[PDB]
Amino acid sequence: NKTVVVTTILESPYVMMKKNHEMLEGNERYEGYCVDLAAEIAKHCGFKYKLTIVGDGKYGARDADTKIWNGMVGELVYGKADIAIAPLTITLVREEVIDFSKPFMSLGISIMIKKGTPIESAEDLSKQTEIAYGTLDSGSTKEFFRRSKIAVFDKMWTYMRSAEPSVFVRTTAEGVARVRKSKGKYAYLLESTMNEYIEQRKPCDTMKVGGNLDSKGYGIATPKGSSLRNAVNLAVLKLNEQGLLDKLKNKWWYDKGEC
Amino acid sequence: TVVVTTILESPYVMMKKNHEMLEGNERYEGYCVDLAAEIAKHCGFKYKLTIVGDGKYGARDADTKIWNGMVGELVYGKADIAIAPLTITLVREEVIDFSKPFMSLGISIMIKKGTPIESAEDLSKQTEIAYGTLDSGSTKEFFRRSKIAVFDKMWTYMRSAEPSVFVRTTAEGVARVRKSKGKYAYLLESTMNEYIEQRKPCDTMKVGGNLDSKGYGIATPKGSSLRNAVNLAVLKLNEQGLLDKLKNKWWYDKGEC
Ligand SMILES: CS(=O)(=O)Nn1c(=O)[nH]c2cc([N+](=O)[O-])c(-n3ccnc3)cc2c1=O
Ligand SMILES: N[C@@H](CCC(=O)O)C(=O)O
């Protein structure tokens, strides 16, 4: 078997630089949930591999003018990498150009509050205005609310689009900082995975509340025609059924946690 | 006309009240009935809903190595596609193809209200309250194959338990919980557990969190000309907000409690 080129992304706690990474080389430089995942996938599929960080540090979107895919997805479609093992969301536009395994992690839109905020659900948020709430100013979460035919979510959308000042943010970091500087009066809506992770880091002043508002997954991606597709897919399923993915999630979110 | 295999399971596929006087696809109603319509429309095919012959989900017989249920119907050419609460699993994915999940779920515990049990660990450490699973489905296989201590102990008890803790249909497991005065707890998927919790006589409840994390997919036989279109159609329907609305319509909107 040829050395498999794995593309991945520096996003905590999926892939991070080890403590002494400057004293290390190759795959030993990195650690995290997706580093452990890549080792398990390689073992089950009988390949050796090289972890490479995606050049542009992006996930994969198609430029609407140039029609060029950036990110890990571009690296797959242009033949620059053999497989992407990262927190890459399974979406229609990507599935049209690459193959995804079944999900290795389930996630969805969720509520981030400052600790002690009287909110426990989307329902709770939808029936008041004292606590302002919002999303990234563009992307899937904003559009989820815009599209939603569910009453509580349409109610939330109607509030959010009218709200002044803007309840929207340019970046995830802006949204998190806005929850923290807000004294309980702002809730941020983001993916549960990131929400649960931030819950477990210092300052330790935020928490996740309520069910997930929708249902998405991260998948392992291969270019179309990859001889790895079937085996990768089965390996993800095997690892899930053995409880290994749950184990890794617990490890990287909680065992490594700081709160 | 595509032959669609499915299973009678509330609220996915249900006989309409006036079914004896109805014909074809109009006999049935539910989440998976609505989903079959959307998928067929998106993929541009005609279809007939046919309830699985043996009323099972699909397991490989340990003696004969023959598949039963919906998986059997796909693998032996009795049906072209399965649109049902069919759990995506390793052993099935080896013999048929699944779309991406149209719904997420995990194994959960159903109790008669007031049963002094709140976790799987609670259950494993006592004999007074009997507990079991559906036969021929993924939950039984989850416990059978499990190497996790708590669930291992649970399977050991379950495989030996007298009389049998296993049931043939979900409605049987639920009727058993309701008839047994707290002496029987049922292990079922969170989706169905939550539905029943919101149905009269409102005498059951879900306890603890899910035991695992998984999804239902639409299944096709290997080499099906339908595989790619169906897979993409599920993602499109999810991103449209349509799968969430359908779940709302059949769970929350029809809630009796
Ligand atoms: C929106 S998309 O089409 O699904 N692309 N996409 C992914 O696939 N995975 C992601 C994972 C993360 N993340 O932190 O794990 C973030 N992230 C980064 C900072 N906050 C969140 C963004 C994305 C992201 O944008
Ligand atoms: N959805 C399961 C059946 C229900 C259960 O096992 O609890 C399957 O496809 O096998």
Side-chain angles (χ1 to χ4, degrees):
Chain A
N1 268 98
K2 186 179 183 187
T3 305
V4 171
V5 181
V6 180
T7 184
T8 190
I9 189 164
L10 286 160
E11 180 88 64
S12 301
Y14 306 94
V15 184
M16 316 169 287
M17 307 306 298
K18 271 191 205 158
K19 205 111 279 186
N20 302 303
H21 69 86
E22 282 204 17
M23 288 156 60
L24 305 166
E25 170 64 319
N27 300 344
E28 303 305 320
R29 284 164 300 170
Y30 313 106
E31 67 177 353
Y33 179 104
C34 285
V35 179
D36 289 349
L37 183 54
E40 289 276 359
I41 295 295
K43 187 86 186 190
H44 285 248
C45 301
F47 68 76
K48 258 55 183 311
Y49 63 101
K50 173 191 181 202
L51 295 167
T52 70
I53 307 296
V54 56
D56 67 8
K58 295 153 205 316
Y59 285 89
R62 185 200 273 124
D63 187 283
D65 301 316
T66 66
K67 315 277 168 200
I68 300 164
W69 285 95
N70 68 15
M72 287 174 290
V73 178
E75 292 193 354
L76 298 178
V77 313
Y78 303 117
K80 193 224 189 53
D82 304 308
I83 193 167
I85 297 168
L88 184 62
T89 312
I90 292 153
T91 63
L92 176 69
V93 289
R94 293 171 171 154
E95 193 83 298
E96 281 167 359
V97 302
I98 50 73
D99 301 318
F100 269 115
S101 68
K102 288 304 182 296
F104 66 84
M105 193 172 290
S106 292
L107 70 148
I109 299 159
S110 66
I111 305 151
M112 174 182 284
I113 54 159
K114 203 210 172 84
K115 286 196 185 313
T117 297
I119 294 301
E120 281 108 36
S121 77
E123 198 81 20
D124 282 5
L125 278 171
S126 78
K127 307 201 276 71
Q128 53 73 250
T129 47
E130 184 60 41
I131 299 150
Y133 56 99
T135 72
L136 273 188
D137 59 21
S138 67
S140 59
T141 308
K142 192 183 174 176
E143 299 314 310
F144 163 92
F145 289 101
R146 183 185 262 104
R147 293 175 192 180
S148 193
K149 293 296 211 323
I150 321 270
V152 42
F153 307 137
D154 188 48
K155 204 171 204 303
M156 287 173 72
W157 170 244
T158 311
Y159 154 84
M160 275 182 293
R161 63 163 175 87
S162 304
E164 294 265 298
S166 183
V167 289
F168 300 108
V169 296
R170 297 200 186 203
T171 78
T172 296
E174 178 188 331
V176 174
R178 193 177 164 166
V179 169
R180 290 172 161 161
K181 288 306 165 184
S182 192
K183 302 148 182 187
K185 298 307 175 72
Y186 186 82
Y188 185 48
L189 292 145
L190 78 173
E191 290 321 304
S192 44
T193 52
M194 182 60 161
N195 197 2
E196 200 166 337
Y197 171 75
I198 296 166
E199 193 175 44
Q200 305 306 323
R201 322 307 300 177
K202 301 177 210 271
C204 299
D205 56 1
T206 67
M207 71 180 287
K208 176 171 74 68
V209 285
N212 290 356
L213 276 58
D214 71 337
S215 289
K216 291 180 265 262
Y218 295 144
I220 296 184
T222 47
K224 294 230 197 301
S226 172
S227 61
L228 294 165
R229 186 198 179 175
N230 183 243
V232 163
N233 185 53
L234 296 168
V236 166
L237 295 173
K238 194 192 257 196
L239 290 177
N240 191 28
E241 287 173 14
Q242 294 179 338
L244 194 269
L245 303 177
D246 288 329
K247 178 150 184 204
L248 291 181
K249 179 85 181 300
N250 178 62
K251 176 185 173 180
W252 292 101
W253 272 250
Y254 292 94
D255 294 358
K256 302 263 161 175
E258 305 180 316
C259 316
Chain B
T1 294
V2 173
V3 179
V4 176
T5 189
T6 198
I7 192 160
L8 287 171
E9 188 69 83
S10 305
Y12 304 92
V13 179
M14 302 171 290
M15 301 308 284
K16 287 190 173 163
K17 205 163 195 170
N18 39 321
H19 69 86
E20 304 259 326
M21 45 168 265
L22 292 173
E23 309 249 56
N25 297 348
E26 297 298 328
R27 289 174 286 173
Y28 314 108
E29 71 177 351
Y31 179 100
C32 279
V33 169
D34 286 351
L35 178 54
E38 290 291 341
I39 294 292
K41 267 156 187 144
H42 279 246
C43 297
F45 62 73
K46 256 188 162 184
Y47 69 101
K48 190 183 62 188
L49 299 160
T50 80
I51 308 302
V52 54
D54 59 4
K56 303 177 182 309
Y57 281 91
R60 187 190 292 279
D61 186 291
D63 292 331
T64 70
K65 200 168 202 147
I66 298 165
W67 285 96
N68 65 31
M70 287 177 290
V71 181
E73 298 199 339
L74 287 175
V75 167
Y76 308 121
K78 297 312 206 291
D80 308 313
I81 191 169
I83 303 182
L86 186 70
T87 306
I88 299 157
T89 65
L90 171 67
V91 290
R92 296 172 176 164
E93 193 85 292
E94 295 179 334
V95 301
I96 55 179
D97 296 317
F98 284 95
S99 69
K100 290 300 189 290
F102 62 83
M103 204 181 284
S104 291
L105 63 310
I107 296 159
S108 65
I109 309 169
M110 170 191 292
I111 58 152
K112 183 88 179 297
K113 260 164 170 49
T115 303
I117 291 298
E118 50 212 48
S119 61
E121 202 176 333
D122 284 2
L123 275 187
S124 58
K125 293 172 174 188
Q126 58 80 63
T127 160
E128 185 64 31
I129 301 144
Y131 57 98
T133 83
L134 184 65
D135 292 300
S136 302
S138 54
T139 301
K140 190 167 174 185
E141 177 78 359
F142 166 97
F143 284 99
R144 176 195 283 114
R145 300 276 142 256
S146 183
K147 284 170 164 65
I148 298 298
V150 173
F151 312 145
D152 195 335
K153 196 187 200 67
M154 281 177 71
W155 171 249
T156 305
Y157 158 77
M158 281 190 284
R159 82 203 305 182
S160 309
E162 327 188 1
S164 192
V165 293
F166 306 110
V167 300
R168 285 187 276 175
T169 67
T170 298
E172 202 174 302
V174 175
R176 196 164 158 186
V177 170
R178 291 182 168 147
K179 275 188 207 284
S180 305
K181 309 171 175 199
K183 297 302 171 190
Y184 182 83
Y186 189 49
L187 296 146
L188 79 176
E189 297 176 331
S190 50
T191 43
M192 296 159 52
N193 199 358
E194 279 153 17
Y195 170 75
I196 296 293
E197 180 157 341
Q198 306 311 330
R199 287 271 301 192
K200 272 174 281 207
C202 306
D203 60 344
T204 67
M205 61 180 281
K206 182 200 195 297
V207 287
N210 298 356
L211 277 51
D212 56 3
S213 176
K214 59 199 174 194
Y216 300 147
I218 292 173
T220 44
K222 299 298 189 184
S224 169
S225 71
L226 292 178
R227 183 195 180 181
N228 178 61
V230 157
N231 186 54
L232 300 178
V234 170
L235 298 177
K236 176 70 176 162
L237 290 179
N238 194 25
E239 282 171 35
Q240 267 180 33
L242 186 141
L243 300 182
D244 291 326
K245 188 197 186 165
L246 283 192
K247 176 138 195 229
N248 191 72
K249 179 199 175 189
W250 293 97
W251 276 251
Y252 317 85
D253 266 20
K254 269 67 166 78
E256 289 173 331
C257 312

